[PDB]
Design a protein around this ligand. Sequence first.
Ligand SMILES: *[C@H](C)[C@H]1/C(=C/c2[nH]c(/C=C3N=C(/C=C4\NC(=O)C(CC)=C4C)C(C)=C\3CCC(=O)O)c(CCC(=O)O)c2C)NC(=O)[C@@H]1C
Ligand SMILES: *[C@H](C)[C@H]1/C(=C/c2[nH]c(/C=C3N=C(/C=C4\NC(=O)C(CC)=C4C)C(C)=C\3CCC(=O)O)c(CCC(=O)O)c2C)NC(=O)[C@@H]1C
Ligand SMILES: *[C@H](C)[C@H]1/C(=C/c2[nH]c(/C=C3N=C(/C=C4\NC(=O)C(CC)=C4C)C(C)=C\3CCC(=O)O)c(CCC(=O)O)c2C)NC(=O)[C@@H]1C
Ligand SMILES: *[C@H](C)[C@H]1/C(=C/c2[nH]c(/C=C3N=C(/C=C4\NC(=O)C(CC)=C4C)C(C)=C\3CCC(=O)O)c(CCC(=O)O)c2C)NC(=O)[C@@H]1C
Ligand SMILES: *[C@H](C)[C@H]1/C(=C/c2[nH]c(/C=C3N=C(/C=C4\NC(=O)C(CC)=C4C)C(C)=C\3CCC(=O)O)c(CCC(=O)O)c2C)NC(=O)[C@@H]1C
Ligand SMILES: *[C@H](C)[C@H]1/C(=C/c2[nH]c(/C=C3N=C(/C=C4\NC(=O)C(CC)=C4C)C(C)=C\3CCC(=O)O)c(CCC(=O)O)c2C)NC(=O)[C@@H]1C
Ligand SMILES: *[C@H](C)[C@H]1/C(=C/c2[nH]c(/C=C3N=C(/C=C4\NC(=O)C(CC)=C4C)C(C)=C\3CCC(=O)O)c(CCC(=O)O)c2C)NC(=O)[C@@H]1C
Ligand SMILES: *[C@H](C)[C@H]1/C(=C/c2[nH]c(/C=C3N=C(/C=C4\NC(=O)C(CC)=C4C)C(C)=C\3CCC(=O)O)c(CCC(=O)O)c2C)NC(=O)[C@@H]1C
Ligand SMILES: *[C@H](C)[C@H]1/C(=C/c2[nH]c(/C=C3N=C(/C=C4\NC(=O)C(CC)=C4C)C(C)=C\3CCC(=O)O)c(CCC(=O)O)c2C)NC(=O)[C@@H]1C
Ligand SMILES: *[C@H](C)[C@H]1/C(=C/c2[nH]c(/C=C3N=C(/C=C4\NC(=O)C(CC)=C4C)C(C)=C\3CCC(=O)O)c(CCC(=O)O)c2C)NC(=O)[C@@H]1C
Ligand SMILES: *[C@H](C)[C@H]1/C(=C/c2[nH]c(/C=C3N=C(/C=C4\NC(=O)C(CC)=C4C)C(C)=C\3CCC(=O)O)c(CCC(=O)O)c2C)NC(=O)[C@@H]1C
Lengths: 172, 172, 172, 172, 162, 162, 162, 203
Amino acid sequence: MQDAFTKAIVAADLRGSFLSEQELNQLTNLVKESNKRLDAVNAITGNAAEIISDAAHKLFAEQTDLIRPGGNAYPNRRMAACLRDMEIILRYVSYALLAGDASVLEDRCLNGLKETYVALGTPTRSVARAVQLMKETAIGYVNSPSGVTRGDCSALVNEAATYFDKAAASIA
Amino acid sequence: MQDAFTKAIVAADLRGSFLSEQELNQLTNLVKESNKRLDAVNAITGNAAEIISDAAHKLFAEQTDLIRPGGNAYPNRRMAACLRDMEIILRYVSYALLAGDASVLEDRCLNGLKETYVALGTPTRSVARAVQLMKETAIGYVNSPSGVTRGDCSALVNEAATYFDKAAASIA
Amino acid sequence: MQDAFTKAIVAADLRGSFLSEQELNQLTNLVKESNKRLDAVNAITGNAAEIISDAAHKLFAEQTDLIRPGGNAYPNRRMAACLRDMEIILRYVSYALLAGDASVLEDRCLNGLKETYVALGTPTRSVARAVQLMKETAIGYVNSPSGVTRGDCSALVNEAATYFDKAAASIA
Amino acid sequence: MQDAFTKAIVAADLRGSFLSEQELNQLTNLVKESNKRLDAVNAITGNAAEIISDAAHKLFAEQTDLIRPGGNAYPNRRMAACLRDMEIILRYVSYALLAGDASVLEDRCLNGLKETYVALGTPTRSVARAVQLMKETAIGYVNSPSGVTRGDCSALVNEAATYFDKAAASIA
Amino acid sequence: MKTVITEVIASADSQGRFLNNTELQAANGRFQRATASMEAARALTSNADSLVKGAVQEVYNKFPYLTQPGQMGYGDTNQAKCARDISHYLRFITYSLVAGGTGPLDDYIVAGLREVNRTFNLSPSWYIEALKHIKGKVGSQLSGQPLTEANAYIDYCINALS
Amino acid sequence: MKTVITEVIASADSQGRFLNNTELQAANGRFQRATASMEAARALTSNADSLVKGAVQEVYNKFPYLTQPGQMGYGDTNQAKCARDISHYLRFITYSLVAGGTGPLDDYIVAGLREVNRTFNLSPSWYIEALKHIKGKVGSQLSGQPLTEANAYIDYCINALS
Amino acid sequence: MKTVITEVIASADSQGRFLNNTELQAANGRFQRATASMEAARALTSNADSLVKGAVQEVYNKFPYLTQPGQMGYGDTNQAKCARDISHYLRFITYSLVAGGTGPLDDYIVAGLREVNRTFNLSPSWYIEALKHIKGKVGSQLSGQPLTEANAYIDYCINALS
Amino acid sequence: LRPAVGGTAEAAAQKQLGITAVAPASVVELRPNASEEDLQGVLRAVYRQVLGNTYVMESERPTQAESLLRNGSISVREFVRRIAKSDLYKERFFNKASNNRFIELNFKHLLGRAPYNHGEIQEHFGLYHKAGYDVEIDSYIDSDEYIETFGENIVPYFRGFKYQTNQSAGGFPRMVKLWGGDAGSDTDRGKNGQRTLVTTKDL
Ligand SMILES: *[C@H](C)[C@H]1/C(=C/c2[nH]c(/C=C3N=C(/C=C4\NC(=O)C(CC)=C4C)C(C)=C\3CCC(=O)O)c(CCC(=O)O)c2C)NC(=O)[C@@H]1C
Ligand SMILES: *[C@H](C)[C@H]1/C(=C/c2[nH]c(/C=C3N=C(/C=C4\NC(=O)C(CC)=C4C)C(C)=C\3CCC(=O)O)c(CCC(=O)O)c2C)NC(=O)[C@@H]1C
Ligand SMILES: *[C@H](C)[C@H]1/C(=C/c2[nH]c(/C=C3N=C(/C=C4\NC(=O)C(CC)=C4C)C(C)=C\3CCC(=O)O)c(CCC(=O)O)c2C)NC(=O)[C@@H]1C
Ligand SMILES: *[C@H](C)[C@H]1/C(=C/c2[nH]c(/C=C3N=C(/C=C4\NC(=O)C(CC)=C4C)C(C)=C\3CCC(=O)O)c(CCC(=O)O)c2C)NC(=O)[C@@H]1C
Ligand SMILES: *[C@H](C)[C@H]1/C(=C/c2[nH]c(/C=C3N=C(/C=C4\NC(=O)C(CC)=C4C)C(C)=C\3CCC(=O)O)c(CCC(=O)O)c2C)NC(=O)[C@@H]1C
Ligand SMILES: *[C@H](C)[C@H]1/C(=C/c2[nH]c(/C=C3N=C(/C=C4\NC(=O)C(CC)=C4C)C(C)=C\3CCC(=O)O)c(CCC(=O)O)c2C)NC(=O)[C@@H]1C
Ligand SMILES: *[C@H](C)[C@H]1/C(=C/c2[nH]c(/C=C3N=C(/C=C4\NC(=O)C(CC)=C4C)C(C)=C\3CCC(=O)O)c(CCC(=O)O)c2C)NC(=O)[C@@H]1C
Ligand SMILES: *[C@H](C)[C@H]1/C(=C/c2[nH]c(/C=C3N=C(/C=C4\NC(=O)C(CC)=C4C)C(C)=C\3CCC(=O)O)c(CCC(=O)O)c2C)NC(=O)[C@@H]1C
Ligand SMILES: *[C@H](C)[C@H]1/C(=C/c2[nH]c(/C=C3N=C(/C=C4\NC(=O)C(CC)=C4C)C(C)=C\3CCC(=O)O)c(CCC(=O)O)c2C)NC(=O)[C@@H]1C
Ligand SMILES: *[C@H](C)[C@H]1/C(=C/c2[nH]c(/C=C3N=C(/C=C4\NC(=O)C(CC)=C4C)C(C)=C\3CCC(=O)O)c(CCC(=O)O)c2C)NC(=O)[C@@H]1C
Ligand SMILES: *[C@H](C)[C@H]1/C(=C/c2[nH]c(/C=C3N=C(/C=C4\NC(=O)C(CC)=C4C)C(C)=C\3CCC(=O)O)c(CCC(=O)O)c2C)NC(=O)[C@@H]1C
């Protein structure tokens, strides 16, 4: 697997060089902000069930068709599969946020997802809407954790946003 | 798997409606003719070895090439495989006749059969000819069962014919 | 798998005939030269580690790129896999030389190799260079064995050459 | 697996000694009689189906109870398993006769056989009688091969006899 | 196809090892036997027409009913199929002699034999009677190690039918 | 590459579970050690040319014969390859320090090491002697937790060679 | 162990078959080779004391450092262990000649060789130098097919060490 | 007497497909009182089948597990389950791949066949999400298919390329997409990485 540190090493190795001072500086900054990062990962994990639930409620209010007969969420079996998928995507985004790299999201979750959905007849645009709904909920938790030291988390929120956005773009 | 009853339910489910009285009536007619259907399935099973043998004799008389050296039914290993295949196809036709629906034949036997044969280099048209020869033998047994109450079985015979015909068309 | 004798009978079978006196004579000639063939196979087996080592040294001297960072033989993991491949090819050439037929090499060793290499990004022309270097070393051992009775081994050397050449042609 | 040569080596190894001239002499004698040994192994293999059949006929005449209902050979399934067992024992005795050592017979066939038979409820003494009947048939074939050069085979016959006897004693 | 040479190669490949003296010694045994095996093969090939005729007739003498009408022996097509089948047997025996293994016989005859014979209602006993006739005539034609080689491949077939 | 962070994520993924406090505690341990690990990595990088040259000379002192003609140490290409190899070792040690795992060393050096060394007849003892030289010099350069980190990655290599 | 006889039996057993002519031909190859193999084995046994003494001295000549103090060649215990090891190699070579396979060499020497040599810091090159010395002296003692047999088993060891 | 015009030899199809070594795959059984030579054969077979002809360096060999197999403390079946749960397996076949690709890899490695329908995918994806990786791997090893074919002493071998009793017709073409050749492998170490050979569209 890859993480931010591992990615830098791999690059330096291809050059056949010791890590450069500039590269070191970037890594040191990641270590310096690691506490904030850990808090953000905690916020998603601690609210994971609520994030998925809140998203699901909003999705099915927006798109009544999925839950009607003939919809892709329509028997209980399919509804269960839809909820399963949302949880899996959230898991991988949270993993990526700890790693600082989107590879884990790409390598397991994202690879072949759109193809699978098209074969099944799952509507990819709706799946993407679900990922956006999860994003709004999740980012809110990260942005307002309780009893955490007041501080600017904007860079971490932006990074989280990109991971959600990657997932959405792949799926759709 | 699918059967005639199961197929009707699936259709009504997509409409999200209770089965209609007309649809119910069709199902009742299938139940009314079920004894004849059972007798037909019995005729194939009871004469299965004879059906295959009689087909095989006719096939090898028609196509001497298969049994000559270099032929696809030469030598014993290949001949054995050919006879096995005929028995498998007959089995699935009999399954479909009990079900009243061709899906079991299509999903498990027919899908990818042509591809298999092409990869192997087996001549598909000869395979199809074998299925037609089996059909003539089988239909004879269905048409003249021993000790059965005299009646018109023609609709059931036609249904059997279609299943054989589907198999032949897929393979060729 | 196949050997020279097995190949001849399979051909005769397709003609549907008893082996011809001419075919018999060719086989008898193979039996007459069998001692020399056994000596040749011995030479490769006895010097197998030397053949691979000598080739490896020459390859890496010719192509510095492979051993540099970014090369396909860097790092140790890749170098190990490269040496494994050289040993496999030599093993199968020796098998083919005992059989008197190239099928063993073609059916097992050569089958899928080019596709594997393309996926990996291994440079096929370098692999081919490696096989040529092995060939020169191996042939030298066959041509100059200790304690073997002097005679003409030219036909066996030429046959060995072809097996190496087949491997090289397949790879690139 | 073990053979007569391998057995002698293992003994000498425990002494940590080069094989003694006496040990060498014994081995040389085995090589000297090897053609006769090969003839004997051929006689059993060539008549294997007859050996089992002739034994089976004698066994079931001797013990009518086995074939009656409630007997251990009494449904077809059991009778088939009985004939399978006789074939396995003969196979392993023939292996042992080529090896010149009973190890293969003991290690693969005989170990646990009596325990298995007792659990099954198979009568061990009848199994032993079957092995003795096979022995008499087999020895006859070895003693009277067709087109073999006339010579004394007595030592080989006695060796075969011991392997049969070992099998019988283990089973019982 | 099982031959001495393919079998040693297969063993080496399973262990992932180069052929060693163990394998080469076995190989030498195949090449030494080849002279006897070739002599057998040539004799069977020379008398193959006559061997088949006598074999087919022997079956009819052993099982007289077959020749009578409504029976498998009756009719030209049936008798022609008999001669074809016995010829196949002889052909694969000579192939096995030359190949230095039972592999030709195993792939062409033995595999699938039981299922085919059941479906076409061909008795193993007819073939066994023909093979035994051949074995007697071959015994007149060949002697010593050629004879031993011939007998082994005929006996292999007889056991497979049995 | 194995790092603390990749290992915790991998475990969670295998269970199919969101990361829990158990994983996050482990992650915190990696990020705290990072300051000492970075200090080590910077020092090894700064002295890398001198470390390598001394390391190579130590091998030549410990095994004088290598430098003599007909021996692996003799000749410019051979000597150059030595310096290249020791430099690789230092590079992968500093990578491991920064990564927070032995994974960089494991994937680049340790896998295949034994097979490569056998084929090229490179003695593990030469490398081990060089690494031990480095360890002594590093000990002068670093102290406390930086030193502990450095010593652990050098020791990992030494044990893998051993 | 691996011998021609055990290998043919193993193959037959795997397929669940009686031994056929294919196997027996292979077996005959082993029994014919036996005369040459026995002659080799007797000659190696007769000169085994001298072969080992010369082999050990050759190692000391090829690597003069070993004899110097603080080195593996130095001291009676070390020198005695050398002579023991080379003697073992000869013993297992003669066993392999008599067995008709490399199996004795494989089970006694080759299995576990690499791990043992690593732990005890025993160089494969010392053994290889001794074996090559023996191979030269054997060449003087034996000729023709005996010599061929001897050379193959010595070469097997050399390749396993390599 | 005259030959068939087309006139292929028996084995021609196998030759043409390159399945000639696996169509009737050799079966390796660990036997009681097995020699050291015999045990090594079994281990080779296991690594080839279970790890998809990917190379295993000497550092990666399990060693302690093999200690048990040599002892008889575990069977071949248990050994296979340890390898499949190991990080050797997980790294190659699981961490880089998607579930869809992982499931079909497991069928090929452990059962020796292709997935017969999208229901097999649905079942095994469902198990993983409820019970994680180890329960999943257990399913294949603890399945009637496994137990009847291989049982306890037989190393898994390739069953596809021959007709199996409950096989669907799609089963043989799917095995052809999974088999790269003798020199093929299922390797993570490629340009494209681990991708799905057998799509949902196929199933
Ligand atoms: C929910 C927002 C939407 C939805 C989802 C949905 N998904 C399926 C079926 C599958 N989803 C997957 C997904 C994955 N495979 C992977 O490997 C990963 C990452 C590890 C994921 C996330 C798979 C494999 C399937 C197919 C197998 C299975 O069904 O178990 C369905 C069911 C569709 C069907 O007809 O089977 C559904 C409903 N569908 C919607 O309508 C939502 C908008
Ligand atoms: C951003 C997401 C919000 C935020 C975060 C924030 N956190 C800190 C400080 C700390 N965070 C932790 C938390 C952890 N460390 C761990 O080891 C674990 C997992 C086991 C956790 C959950 C710690 C240790 C600290 C330091 C101690 C402290 O209480 O300060 C800060 C302060 C800056 C820093 O990096 O030290 C901030 C800003 N705060 C916000 O306002 C965001 C909405
Ligand atoms: C007989 C009428 C014809 C014939 C048949 C033949 N088939 C094979 C080989 C195979 N047949 C199958 C087919 C099936 N697999 C399935 O899943 C199904 C139904 C679901 C079928 C019917 C398969 C998979 C094989 C390959 C595996 C095997 O060989 O066992 C052969 C042998 C080809 C070869 O060279 O091996 C033959 C001869 N051939 C004829 O000549 C007839 C027209
Ligand atoms: C049509 C293929 C030929 C035919 C069939 C036929 N059958 C009946 C009547 C009955 N068939 C059965 C037989 C079964 N019932 C079962 O439960 C089973 C399986 C366990 C079988 C095989 C029964 C019970 C009946 C009714 C009692 C009776 O013997 O009449 C008929 C009469 C009409 C009807 O089915 O009600 C007919 C026509 N007869 C032909 O003439 C066709 C050639
Ligand atoms: C050495 C001359 C060149 C080289 C080789 C190299 N090979 C691989 C990887 C593989 N090699 C094979 C090949 C085979 N496997 C077999 O069983 C057979 C015989 C049937 C062959 C020939 C395989 C399957 C692999 C791929 C899967 C695996 O992991 O082993 C590599 C590794 C590439 C990587 O990126 O890790 C290399 C380097 N490369 C060179 O540059 C040399 C010229
Ligand atoms: C050609 C590669 C080189 C060469 C070969 C050569 N060999 C012989 C003679 C013999 N070769 C053997 C060797 C074996 N017999 C076996 O059983 C085995 C496997 C265990 C081997 C390795 C034998 C028995 C002989 C015959 C007796 C003898 O030692 O002479 C010759 C002589 C001609 C012949 O075929 O008899 C030759 C030419 N010789 C060279 O000069 C080539 C470089
Ligand atoms: C025949 C002479 C007598 C006889 C035999 C008989 N055996 C069984 C069942 C088994 N026999 C064995 C034995 C072996 N399996 C092996 O692998 C080997 C070599 C190690 C042998 C010899 C085994 C294991 C079984 C049980 C499993 C199986 O059947 O495959 C039966 C059947 C008993 C039952 O109720 O299942 C019989 C009848 N019995 C007689 O009466 C004869 C005197
Ligand atoms: C004892 C069972 C009977 C007997 C044996 C006997 N055999 C021979 C001679 C030979 N036997 C063989 C046979 C083989 N060699 C092989 O390579 C194979 C397998 C492929 C076989 C089956 C051979 C080659 C010979 C030697 C040549 C010959 O024909 O003589 C003898 C003769 C002397 C000897 O000890 O070799 C004898 C005595 N004789 C009997 O009367 C017993 C009933
Ligand atoms: C002669 C002893 C008797 C006889 C023969 C007879 N044979 C058949 C049919 C078949 N025989 C074979 C045999 C082979 N085909 C092969 O490919 C091989 C291996 C190379 C063999 C040995 C086969 C497969 C058939 C069936 C297909 C075919 O017709 O060719 C028949 C016809 C049986 C039927 O009912 O169709 C007959 C009559 N006839 C005699 O006179 C003897 C009693
Ligand atoms: C230094 C202690 C001694 C020495 C070393 C030396 N090395 C080689 C050759 C090789 N060294 C390596 C090592 C690596 N390759 C890698 O990819 C890695 C991991 C990143 C390492 C550490 C390799 C693979 C080779 C062989 C192939 C090549 O040439 O690159 C040699 C030359 C040996 C030869 O003949 O090929 C030498 C001499 N040099 C000295 O003088 C010291 C004794
Ligand atoms: C001779 C070339 C050099 C030498 C050798 C030497 N060997 C050892 C120690 C061992 N030798 C072996 C080898 C074997 N043991 C076996 O069981 C077999 C196969 C049957 C062999 C060939 C083993 C295992 C050991 C280690 C355990 C032991 O002491 O018995 C040493 C001592 C190693 C140490 O440092 O402890 C030596 C020195 N001696 C010389 O003079 C040459 C340089």
